[PDB]
Design a protein around this ligand. Sequence first.
Ligand SMILES: [Cl-]
Ligand SMILES: [Cl-]
Lengths: 297, 297
Amino acid sequence: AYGVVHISVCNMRDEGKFTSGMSTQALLGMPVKVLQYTGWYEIQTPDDYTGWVHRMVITPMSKEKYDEWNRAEKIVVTSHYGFTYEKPDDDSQTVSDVVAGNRLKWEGSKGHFYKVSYPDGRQAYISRHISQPESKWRASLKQDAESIIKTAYTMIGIPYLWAGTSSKGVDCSGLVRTVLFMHDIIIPRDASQQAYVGERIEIAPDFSNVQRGDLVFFGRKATADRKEGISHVGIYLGNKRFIHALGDVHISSFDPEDECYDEFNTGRLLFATRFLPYINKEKGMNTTDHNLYYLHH
Amino acid sequence: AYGVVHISVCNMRDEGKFTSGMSTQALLGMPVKVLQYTGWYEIQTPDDYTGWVHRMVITPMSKEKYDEWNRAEKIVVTSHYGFTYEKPDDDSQTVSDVVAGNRLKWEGSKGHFYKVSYPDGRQAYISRHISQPESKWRASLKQDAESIIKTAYTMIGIPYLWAGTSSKGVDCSGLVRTVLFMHDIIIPRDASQQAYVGERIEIAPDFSNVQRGDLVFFGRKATADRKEGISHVGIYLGNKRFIHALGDVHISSFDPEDECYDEFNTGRLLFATRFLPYINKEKGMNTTDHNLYYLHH
Ligand SMILES: [Cl-]
Ligand SMILES: [Cl-]
């Protein structure tokens, strides 16, 4: 009934087969609920999203051991990319790759390394240059618009990947989720669900009422006969510019004077949302230390 | 009719839509043939594999411009992961991520960095610690079994990813292709096509006629009414062990005395192939400086 992801990034699919489309991705050390087993596991991530994974990428656990995994202080991976090693030496045999958001059980310290262990039982060493203890990490965390935009800028040029939810590759809602997870925040996975959390902002023609860190939503405008359709999402940067994933992670503008002007999305702009003031104050938006998948209940 | 990939890893799909399954991946700086345009490009990689990509991930070019891209000396990315920067400073704004096998146009040198340019026109700086000039790289290259196994071991723990063809995540045939591309070698994309290049080895019960660096193939054994089916592939390491992608990149054994014994694949082992002595000596197996997609013709 419970499991923990034990690979850097696992690929959740619409059905329990590789020949089905990827729907989302979960990260190393992330607790999940297990809904069924058919040879493949149907799992549920802390954002309530459900998808299918191969049997070998998660560690099934009793409620007791799942609660013990969640209780243990973690080493949090803060760099986009890296590796873990068999020895506290970056020239020794690797154990796996890691991505930002990966969390491993803290087992000690040696040199400039943290001793860590995987949910499956593997032991490794990880550099203090790409990671830090969870307690130290939480205490220095910032969750304001400037901090989230600063993270979003470190992701420029990263490829677009349909259902991509990690530093390896992201889709439009996946970019928002990856950046936010680096600041301990979870919001819904789909762009359609992200559009209806936080405060809806009806954009002024000059964009004067849209702030840095707001999300911008694109799609089919509501008609009298048909409700609005959400097809895309970006993060507002101020000055009529936004960062988003389309082809790759890049900056675009609503101003035709800018070389990065995005004509197709400017014409489909529907509204903005202010969500950062409402984390842990509204359903669907929380931090991992307030999320019930991470806590005994 | 010609294009060049301009993102670290692009995702080629069975149809021109994200809701179709991924079939393979191409890398930054890789020349491709453009077969059609529908809003999405149908492209063909240097392994003759065809797939669909979004319009914004490739730079279409005239035959002239494509030939000029292929002639220019490249900076080759040799590390699994990294970034390019706007300035010769690793604290400056990034341009994109890079993976091993990525190739950029060499534009100069500054400090411990190479000045590079992307097929789309972006300019960046890339560290000398994760990359090297193509000419120096080719002259230093080893293409023997020991060298290919050494690369395969640097990929342990990396996730399995259906149609994965890069350091980010690999499938079984994808592992082979990624390891080989890091040694300038191209062989067919599908495990079904890899099985019929090189010399077929009928495995002796004690494995005494199987050598390090041989490929091992799994599937359905040939019956009188039905030909053999190829479902999986691994690289032989000697001592009845092999490295492969299944859940993640890991080592498995054909010996039940070993803890890493793989019962399901041991029972489906069909044959081995010796391919490394036949690069540039048989159709479908070549080096990039012998591959017609990389050369004027
Ligand atoms: Cl994609
Ligand atoms: Cl997968």
